[PDB]
Amino acid sequence: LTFCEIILMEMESHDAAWPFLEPVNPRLVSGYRRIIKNPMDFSTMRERLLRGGYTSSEEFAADALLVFDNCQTFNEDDSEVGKAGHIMRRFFESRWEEFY
Numbered sequence: 001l002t003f004c005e006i007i008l009m010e011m012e013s014h015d016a017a018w019p020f021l022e023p024v025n026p027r028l029v030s031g032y033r034r035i036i037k038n039p040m041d042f043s044t045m046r047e048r049l050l051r052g053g054y055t056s057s058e059e060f061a062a063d064a065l066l067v068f069d070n071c072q073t074f075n076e077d078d079s080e081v082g083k084a085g086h087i088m089r090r091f092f093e094s095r096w097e098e099f100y
């Protein structure tokens with residue numbers, strides 16, 4: 001869970017991390033409530049981590065991949081959020097496989 005802190009901090013401070021810092025506001029994003037069943041962002045993961053709500057690193061990795069799966073589900077690959085999402089997803093997978 002130490003590395004979970006390291007990689008979350010690096011993700012939170014990443015350049016392309018702007019679409020995933022805060023939860024998506026369904027009032028502002030049309031159809032998001034309908035398309036995405038399990039919304040997830042970095043702050044939600046951050047709150048769960050500080051509270052200690054992560055049993056294992058796998059549960060952490062699950063929510064991380066959930067962020068990028070949700071991004072790919074709702075946004076186009078050539079969209080601004082989509083392009084930022086591909087950067088963040090590749091960043092996570094890379095750093096995650098470095099440690100483990």
Ligand SMILES: CNC(=O)c1cc(Cl)ccn1
Nearest residue numbers: 019020024029071074081
């Ligand atoms: C992760 N962010 C999104 O999925 C998103 C998508 C759109 Cl269209 C607007 C704001 N946020």
